[PDB]
Amino acid sequence: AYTNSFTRGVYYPDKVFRSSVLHSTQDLFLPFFSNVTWFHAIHVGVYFASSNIIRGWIFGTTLDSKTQSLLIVNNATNVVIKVCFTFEYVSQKNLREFVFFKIYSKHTPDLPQGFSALEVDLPIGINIAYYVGYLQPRTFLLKYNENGTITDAVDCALDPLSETKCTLKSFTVEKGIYQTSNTESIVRFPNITNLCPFGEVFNATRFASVYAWNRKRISNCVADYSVLYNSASFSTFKCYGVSPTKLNDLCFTNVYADSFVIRGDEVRQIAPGQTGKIADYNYKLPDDFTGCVIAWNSNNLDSKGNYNYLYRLFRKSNLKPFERDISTEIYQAGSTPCNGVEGFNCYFPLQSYGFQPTNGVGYQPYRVVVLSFELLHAPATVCGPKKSTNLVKNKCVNFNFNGLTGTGVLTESNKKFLPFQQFGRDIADTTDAVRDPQTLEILDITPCSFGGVSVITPGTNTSNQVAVL
Amino acid sequence: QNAQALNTLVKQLSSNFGAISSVLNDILSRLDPPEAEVQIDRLITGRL
């Protein structure tokens, strides 16, 4: 029962007044020249427009009372909104519009050419005569009159004349030529099958002292850290190169796992560019750092008192980034070269922690593990959990090869790479040729937008016929 | 002259203008919108 939409649609978008302005608003409207489903059958963003027999309407993601449902019903001048036949909203031929959680309002009295103008925000917080309609995101240039009434508007994707009118923000285009402007998904991650030693680096019964912080490379792991927040409770996690949310979408060329045990009132010193007897004499983090830092309380295990932990306290020189120093030549703060004597102005370098179950928070041991890495370099070993699809072989795709995103047509390649050689960068330093992380083949990327349209037109006054170039 | 000026206009897509990197997809795939935007903007102000 399709029928052609003629001129109806446009609604007053926002609560701000405008008069005698050709404003352009990017919102979802009713298309011109569209299919309304006229229903007269008497013998399950969206739109709606209709002796007032239909009242309300019901939705949900599945509608089986296992998940949240939603019932909205209208009345003569009353409404009832619930989750059922956790919210109890109660208030006070012909087209009375019930326009769409975003519902609209402002009804107003097939369809002639009249150009009406339409307009409570009802919260839900959950997942979701007699005419009909629909809305999709399509630009509209509204013509506010001298009194605030929308007298004219232009669809912005309907006809070439419409695109030219949008480009010039005008209703009258003169004779000439105008230069208007003018897929699936692939994911490919390497063939790593095994996890990483989560339960070997995070719950080791003993960690090393700070001044001799341990170090461990990780390789060939698909690290799904979701399995980690079931057991421990991390008191600090601040990634410094990459936003935390995207940590399961990339691949990490090399990764290290530095581990040690500092006091509670020092965990803030593990950060690029700070001072303290941890950031000067024990473990210095480089300024151009990239990595994540993890730290949680450990008073349950590393406490007796526990004197098995040491830290370097006296030194005449600050450490450089990532500079382990182990030595026992006692410090010389004065004049004489004290040869082992912990005497005047010459003391031992290393001291201990008096970790104790009675220590106040801030004196409690805090295990710390930092994970340094480097992103989107050529060879990648450790990656994220996500799976891999198959190649599409010459169709436009939003590929996700080995971390990096990108759009284009994935044609076959003949680039004579070195067996050592992975990525081809173009003259503008934009990647164009890639090595498949699974088939070890070579693909070429051709971005496709293919611009350069023009609209040959006589004066819009003279006629409507236009020719595209 | 008209083929030398236009070649610089392409050479200058390799400069990151103080951002994290010079490839927009890199920035988009390493940072969330709250922090991605503050880098894209020092790209968009560098190419314009």
Binding site: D426, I427, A428, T446, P447 | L6, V10
Partner: peptide, 29 residues
């Protein structure tokens, strides 16, 4: 202009064309 050559280019206009003289695809992309 000469009758012999297919175009109406004269014997001096051609000496100019044959004297005045990938990346262009990249610009196109």
């Amino acid at each position: 202009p000469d009758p012999s050559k297919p175009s109406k280019r004269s014997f001096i206009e051609d000496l100019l064309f044959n004297k005045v003289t990938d990346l262009i695809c990249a610009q196109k992309f």
